[PDB]
Structures are given as structure tokens and as C-alpha cells.
């Protein structure tokens, strides 16, 4: 397991968060190896999944499309991150896969699973058993949300992950059908003074509602795995949301369409950059081949940061500090990913999506960004008050900045930010349980 070594990805909002749990009588090492190998089939193409009846999430709607997965194990602190699900849905985890080895009844097991996790949408479990009896085999293969594989996860993992996607699409479609008749008010309006307003130390209703609904429709498509229609929805979302001057939601919409740009580039399809984004943000209509994609991404990112800044003086529609900081981390790691090659090629497109770090490499002359723009951008992270948010945000921010500086080759800066991490972890007013990665952290320092 890899706990305090976060390094986000710019396609993270497209990635699907899935919480994994050790049902039964497992050990730490065996479970860690199991989940690590299970986190190797997270590119389930939409071609190999069989279709679904409903149209707006049918896997038989686009020949390409990778349908990422993001397997994780940390139960993030709910009841405070619950509030900002209306603003964007991908924050909420959706599908549970539970590893089980006890030869126990799947029906009662998943019954108690659902009783424990009412909030989550798509539960399912997988048996890591060595030759379970035929009586259990009949019961499990009768039902869909229960599967079985031999220990070490090497029997039918591909088809299993195909089917998990198949149930997940149906479950998300049910969720959206239940969810498409809501007001979708901003998290500031939802919580009042429950989310910090990012204290720095540096005819107007129906159209807004329609724009927000079109946004969330496009965002659900983006998470579901059909992206050309997601782009076509994001265009008419942004153009309608610009005139109503709702800066906060427009920022996330612009972020989403930028993610669409990157991932369609990764899939290697042609697409014109729309006149609306070209008008709202300059480039300094036209095919992607006649423009350098990273500079486009950079100016888009800068403009959405500008809108998040411009959306602070409104008391109940202010962008939450968690979203602001996480987006900043996302752009910073994107810049570091770009700063490894003069050519913006399939290699780095694979790196950014698959999250392989490739520590240390030969520097080619004249990379995309210099090694001062990255540092100057990372200095923006300290401009916001950091020692007031809680430990998840603190550790994620300081750990990814440490990794950023390590890739840039600023060893003593990495030492500085790791020291900041250590004091921040010390100052928490709650007991913390031992992990074998604090060992690695102290050794590295």
C-alpha cells in the first residue's frame, strides 16, 4: 500500500474512485499484494463490455473509451466532503469491491455490507478462495454482484473487471435518473459556514439552473466514459453559463472541458477547439494539430484559477478551499509531467494517465516549461492559509509538493516541505495508527 505518497493526475475527475475492503480473515501483506495486483486492470475498454438498455450511458455508444478505475483503500472523512457532491459528483466514491476469503454466504455478507455503507451506490464482492465447493459455486455464479477467483487474483480478473464496469454503468444510470430533478445549489449555500472560504495571505434563475444541469449532465458522461458527447455537452454548458455570470460553476465546467481535450488527445481523435473556449480564453475553427496542446491547457488552467479568484466576494457561492487546493495540485503535477521532454508525445500522455513516475532521467534541451515557472506556480500553494485545514488535505498537499520538488531536482526544497509535513502531522490533535510508510518518510528525510 502507498499511503502518504500522493501524486494526483489531471484526468483524476475522469478516474473512478473505488473503495476496497478486506472481508474475512486476511493479513496485511496478502491483502496489500491482492489490491496491488487488482490495481493493474484499470483500463477496461468499452468494447469488451456488453451493452445496456438505456441510451445516455450505453457502452455501445462509442468504439473507443478507456473507462478508468482508481482503486483506493482510505475511507475519507465523510459528512464534510459530502456537501460538495452537488457541485461535482466524482468526489463521491460509487462502487465497492470487497475481497472476501471465508467461504461464507455472499447474500448475508453483502447484506451487512449494504447496511454498513448505505451512502454508496454499487456494492459487490469477490471470493479469493482456493477451490470453493460446487454448492457455493452455483449460488455465486447465479448472481452478478458476486464473483470468485483463485488466490493471488489470476483466474478471471479481466472478465471480472469487465462485469464490474457493466454493473457500475447501470448503477450510475439509476443514480442519475434519481438525481436529475434536484435544484443543485452551491456548497456554500448548502453548508453556510461549514466550508472555509480559502482565506488567502497574498431573469437570472432559470438559465442558471439549466446551465448547471447541462454541466452535471456532461460531468456524469465524463465520469461514465463517453467523451465526445461530453465535449458537445460542455460546449453548450459553458456558453450558456458565461452570460449568467456564475463564475464558480463555470470554472469547473472549463476544467472539465480541458480534461476532455487532454483525454481525447490521448485517445487520438481529431476535434476542433470550440469558438466559445477560444473567445473566453485567448490562445496567444482550428484543428488540435495546429496548436501546441500544453500551452492551451496552461492558459485554460490560468483562466479557471482567475475565475475561482473572482468568485470570492459572494458570500454563499464561494469556491471551497479544498477544491481550490486540489485543483492547484492537479495543475502543478501536470506541469511537472510536461517538464520531462521536448516532445509532447504518446509516452508522456501514457505517463500522465497511468501514473508512472520514472524517477530521474536524462534532461533534454529546452523542455516545455522552464524550471522556474514550475517553482513560481508552486509558490502559489503557500499563498493560501495551510495550517487550518485538516490532515488529509495537509498531507496530500505537502506530499505531492515533495514529489514535485524531487522531480524538479530541488533536494533541499524537498527537505523543507517534508519538514513542513512532519510538523503538520505532529500538530494534529488526534491519535494516528502506525503504517510502514512513515518508516520510508523518516528514512527519506
Amino acid at each position: 500500500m502507498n499511503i502518504l505518497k500522493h501524486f494526483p493526475s489531471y484526468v483524476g475527475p475522469s478516474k473512478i474512485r473505488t473503495l476496497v475492503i478486506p472481508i474475512g480473515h486476511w493479513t496485511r501483506k496478502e491483502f496489500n499484494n491482492a489490491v496491488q495486483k487488482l490495481s493493474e486492470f484499470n483500463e477496461i475498454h468499452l468494447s469488451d463490455v456488453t451493452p445496456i438498455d438505456s441510451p445516455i450511458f450505453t457502452p455501445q455508444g462509442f468504439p473507443h473509451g478507456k473507462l478508468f478505475f482508481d482503486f483506493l483503500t482510505i475511507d475519507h472523512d465523510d459528512a464534510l466532503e459530502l456537501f460538495l457532491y452537488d457541485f461535482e459528483p466524482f468526489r463521491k466514491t460509487f462502487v465497492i469491491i470487497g475481497l472476501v476469503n471465508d467461504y461464507s454466504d455472499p447474500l448475508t455478507n453483502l447484506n451487512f455490507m449494504k447496511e454498513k455503507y448505505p451512502t454508496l451506490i454499487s456494492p459487490n464482492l469477490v471470493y479469493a478462495s482456493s477451490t470453493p465447493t460446487k454448492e457455493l459455486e452455483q449460488t455465486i455464479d447465479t448472481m452478478e454482484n458476486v464473483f470468485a477467483s483463485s488466490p493471488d487474483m489470476q483466474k478471471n480478473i479481466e472478465t471480472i473487471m469487465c462485469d464490474i464496469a457493466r454493473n457500475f454503468l447501470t448503477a450510475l444510470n439509476s443514480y442519475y435518473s434519481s438525481y436529475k430533478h434536484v435544484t443543485l445549489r452551491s456548497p456554500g449555500a448548502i453548508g453556510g459556514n461549514a466550508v472555509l472560504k480559502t482565506t488567502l495571505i497574498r431573469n437570472r434563475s432559470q438559465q442558471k439552473s439549466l446551465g448547471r444541469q447541462m454541466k452535471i449532465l456532461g460531468n456524469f458522461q465524463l465520469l461514465a466514459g463517453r467523451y465526445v458527447d461530453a465535449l458537445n455537452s460542455f460546449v453548450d454548458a459553458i456558453t450558456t453559463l458565461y452570460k449568467v455570470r456564475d463564475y464558480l460553476w463555470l470554472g469547473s465546467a472549463l476544467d472539465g472541458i480541458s480534461i476532455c481535450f487532454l483525454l481525447l488527445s490521448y485517445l487520438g481523435l481529431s476535434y476542433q477547439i470550440p469558438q466559445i473556449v477560444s473567445l473566453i480564453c485567448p490562445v496567444e475553427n482550428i484543428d488540435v494539430e495546429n496548436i501546441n496542446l500544453p500551452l492551451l491547457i496552461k492558459c485554460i488552467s490560468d483562466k479557471v484559477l482567475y475565475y475561482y479568484d473572482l468568485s470570492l466576494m459572494h458570500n454563499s457561492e464561494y469556491a471551497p478551499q479544498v477544491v481550490y487546493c486540489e485543483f492547484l495540485l492537479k495543475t502543478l503535477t501536470f506541469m511537472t509531467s510536461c517538464y520531462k521532454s521536448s516532445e509532447f508525445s504518446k509516452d508522456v500522455l501514457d505517463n500522465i494517465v497511468k501514473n508512472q513516475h520514472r524517477a530521474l532521467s536524462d534532461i533534454p534541451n529546452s523542455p516545455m516549461f522552464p524550471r522556474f515557472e514550475v517553482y513560481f506556480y508552486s509558490n502559489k500553494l503557500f499563498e493560501l492559509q495551510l495550517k487550518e485545514m485538516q490532515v488529509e488535505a495537509q498531507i496530500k498537499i505537502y506530499s505531492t509538493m515533495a514529489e514535485v520538488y524531487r522531480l524538479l531536482g530541488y533536494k533541499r526544497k524537498q527537505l523543507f516541505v517534508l519538514r513542513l509535513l512532519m510538523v503538520a502531522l505532529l500538530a494534529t490533535p488526534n491519535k494516528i495508527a502506525w503504517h510502514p510508510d512513515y518508516r520510508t518518510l523518516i528514512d527519506t528525510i
Binding site: 475492503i21 486476511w26 493479513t27 494516528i432 502506525w434 503504517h435
Partner: peptide, 22 residues
Amino acid sequence: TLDKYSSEEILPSFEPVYSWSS
């Protein structure tokens, strides 16, 4: 030794491997 002692244990079922806050 703690390093090997924690490697093999009985995990609390129906719970994550490692939670942060109480």
C-alpha cells in the same frame, strides 16, 4: 519486532486497512 509483527495480523473485517480521523 514491530516491522514483521504488523506484517501478519487479523484485519478488522468490514473496515478499511487504515483510517485517518476518528
